[PDB]
């Protein structure tokens, strides 16, 4: 039984020792903040990448629209030509492209909504760091009062 | 001419496939972006502990 019992005593001592070594208010906040700052930068980069990706999709979408217009002209030409097969092929091409374009547009709209949310989240994250700084400023003010007491001793 | 027409049809299909592939990577990126948003929430919880 004691082996299990021994671990509990050891665990409590170990846990207490570990927390004390790393129990610094400034260090803990800074490490988290640095990670957050890096994440924010990454998020901004991702948003920029997403915008670039969205732009690429738009260019592809634009090309598809142009292709459809070209296909429409060909379809009109086919009617003038009087060949049933040529006209039928053009119609089929237009339909798949239109469906693809619609899907792309829906995806783009979703992507646009998503990037905006990310931007809003980034702004919220930016606001959060400022709030943390304000809290730190209050702590700094408290430190000055402690320093003043030390100054009195010097006198 | 028949071979060329077939080749022309084939290259167009490949181009369409490439466009689809390009679209697929964007979708994957969007999924990754959603995951990134989740990570920020986890970071916020850590920030509260720091306070």
Residue numbers in the entry:
A (entry chain AC): 1 to 155
B (entry chain F): 105 to 155
Q: What does the published report state?
A:
Here, using a combination of evolutionary and structural analyses, we show that these protein families are homologous and share a common ancient evolutionary origin that likely predates the last universal common ancestor. This homology is evident in cryo-electron microscopy structures of Vipp1 rings from the cyanobacterium Nostoc punctiforme presented over a range of symmetries. Rings have an inner lumen that is able to bind and deform membranes.
Reconstructions were also generated for the other six symmetries and complete ring models built. Rungs are maximally constricted at the top and bottom with internal lumen diameters of 14 nm and 15.7 nm, and widest at the ring equator between rungs 3 and 4 with an internal diameter of 17.5 nm. The analysis of different ring symmetries, ranging from C11–C17, provides us with a view of the structural flexibility that enables Vipp1, PspA, and ESCRT-III family members to perform their functions. Furthermore, as each ring comprises between 5–7 rungs stacked together to build a dome-shaped architecture, these asymmetric structures provide us with a glimpse of the structural features that enable filament tilt in the context of an ESCRT-III-like polymer. Based on the Vipp1C11–C17 models, where helix α5C is positioned at the tip of the spike, α6 helices likely coat the ring outside surface and do not contribute directly to polymer formation. When membrane was modeled into the Vipp1C11–C17 structures as a 4-nm bilayer, sequential constriction was observed with the membrane lumen reaching ∼3 nm within Vipp1C11.
